[PDB]
């Protein structure tokens, strides 16, 4: 990602 | 080119420990969280939890808090799943899958079989009689699975390998292969029956009666 | 946990027709963010799952437009228009909104194709098996449709029922047919006291049974 990590940072 | 390649099948007895690996290639490992999912024929898919590959922190679903551990080796783009004090019920296919807002890439799956029963290798029997059908009957083995190939995998078309059935006589399965009649017995046809559990493979060439 | 209930359990659909598979969650799967992390996966026999739809209705890269998803809150439906042979498999819904993430039990998509008569082949016991004291007669009934078939074994003309083991393959991803193995296992002692072993199959493709036999 782009993002992710279980729903954002 | 993005792939999650998992370690091979394991057979353990209750109380033992096993460690499964899931190696990512084609992308930066630390950019996607990695989940572990358990699949069994009588319960379906169960999400076990996941591990944040950047922070290294694992999250376990309640049914997997205890005997299970997720870890990483980022230099090798690998996620590990260790299961301690194995139970019969841990018998399943385990998948790692990466997740951003969905599981776009799933691992190849690792089947773990846990049994206290005596391993018994397969008796493999040849099945000989424009197209001709041949086969192999595989009996008396335990536990599952057995892998069947024809000509070490080079004969893949026209093959039917049947699901195993467990009975008093333990597991039985069969496989048929159909080839042009004019090519047998002139171009040999051999079934290879592999049973990882017993560290045995039997190759039976089918010949005319 | 959020229970995911799928319907139908089995879904036979003719090639070209549309198939609709649904999933109902025990509670709302709208994530705190307002997004709904709901996906549809397809798993073929002996294969890893493949993503089809994410965030309820978004087709994942590479997914045919024949696949579409809709719904909201607790009820969702995957629609597959113009069903093709390779669509065969088990479809699963999944929610990634509430921990623990959970999957539906799966819906098996059965493809309805043109009836096909089975190709039947019978095989006698191998010498290796006879040496061990057993005697299995095997009958393969291959590439037929519909799946519905009855196999009867006869020994010297008399119906025999004990000692029969049947097994069926999953539908074929290429030709959408089914295949079946029926094995009659006797002891060598009993096998050697009889002459004719017959496998006969009743299938709608034939007014009368398809008969294959082996004589000792």
From TrEMBL, chain B:
Residues 6-115 form the Ig-like domain. GO terms for biological process: adaptive immune response. Disulfide bonds join 22-96. Transmembrane segments: none annotated. Keywords: Adaptive immunity, Disulfide bond, Immunity, Immunoglobulin. The keyword Disulfide bond applies. This is Anti-CEA 79 single chain Fv. The chain holds residues 6 to 118 of 241 of the full protein.
TrEMBL record, chain C:
PANTHER family: IMMUNOGLOBULIN LIGHT CHAIN (PTHR23267). Gene3D superfamilies: Immunoglobulins (2.60.40.10). GO terms for biological process: adaptive immune response. It holds the Pfam family C1-set. The keyword Disulfide bond applies. One of its GO terms (molecular function) is metal ion binding. This is If kappa light chain. Transmembrane segments: none annotated. InterPro entries: Ig-like_dom, Ig-like_dom_sf, Ig-like_fold, Ig/MHC_CS, Ig_C1-set, Ig_sub, Ig_V-set, IgV_Light_Chain. Disulfide bonds join 23-93, 139-199. It comes from the Eukaryota. Coiled coil: none annotated. GO terms for cellular component: extracellular region; immunoglobulin complex; plasma membrane. Signal peptide: none annotated.
């Amino acid at each position: 990602x782009x993002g992710x990590x279980x729903x954002x940072x | 080119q993005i792939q999650l390649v998992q370690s091979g099948p394991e057979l353990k007895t209750p109380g033992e420990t096993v460690r499964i690996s899931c190696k990512a290639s084609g992308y930066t490992f630390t950019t996607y969280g990695m989940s572990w999912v358990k699949q069994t024929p009588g319960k379906g898919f169960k999400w076990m939890g996941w591990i944040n590959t950047y922070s290294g922190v694992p999250t376990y679903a309640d049914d997997f808090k205890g005997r299970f551990a997720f870890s990483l080796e980022t230099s090798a783009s690998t996620a590990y799943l260790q299961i301690n004090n194995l139970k019969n019920e841990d018998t399943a296919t385990y998948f790692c899958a990466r997740r951003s807002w969905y599981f776009d890439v799933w691992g190849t799956g690792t089947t773990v079989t846990v049994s206290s029963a005596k391993t018994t290798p397969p008796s493999v029997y040849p099945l000989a009689p424009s197209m001709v059908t041949l086969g192999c009957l595989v009996k008396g083995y335990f536990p599952e699975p057995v892998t069947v190939t024809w000509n070490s995998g080079s004969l893949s078309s026209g093959v039917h390998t049947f699901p195993a059935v467990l009975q008093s006589d333990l597991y039985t399965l069969s496989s048929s292969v159909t080839v042009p009649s004019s090519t047998w017995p002139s171009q040999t046809v051999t079934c290879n029956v592999a049973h990882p559990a017993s560290s045995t493979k039997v190759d039976k060439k089918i010949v005319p009666r | 946990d959020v229970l995911m209930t799928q319907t139908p359990l089995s879904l036979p659909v003719s090639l070209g027709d549309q198939a609709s598979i649904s999933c109902k969650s025990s509670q709302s799967i709208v994530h705190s963010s307002g997004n709904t992390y709901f996906e549809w996966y397809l798993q073929k026999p002996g294969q890893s799952p493949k993503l089809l739809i994410y965030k309820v209705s978004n087709r994942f890269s590479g997914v045919p437009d024949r696949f579409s998803g809709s719904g909201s809150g607790t009820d969702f439906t995957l629609k597959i228009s113009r069903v093709e042979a390779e669509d065969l498999g088990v479809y699963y819904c999944f929610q990634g909104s509430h921990i623990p993430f959970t999957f539906g039990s799966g819906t098996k998509l059965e493809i309805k194709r043109a009836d096909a008569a089975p190709t039947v082949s019978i095989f006698p016991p191998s010498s290796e098996q006879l040496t061990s004291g057993g005697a299995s007669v095997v009958c393969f009934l291959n590439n037929f449709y519909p799946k519905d078939i009855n196999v009867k074994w006869k020994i010297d003309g008399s119906e025999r029922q004990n000692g029969v083991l049947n097994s069926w393959t999953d539908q074929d991803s290429k030709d959408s047919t089914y295949s079946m193995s029926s094995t009659l296992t006797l002891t060598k002692d009993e096998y050697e006291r009889h002459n004719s072993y017959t496998c006969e199959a009743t299938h709608k493709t034939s007014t009368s049974p398809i008969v294959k036999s082996f004589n000792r």
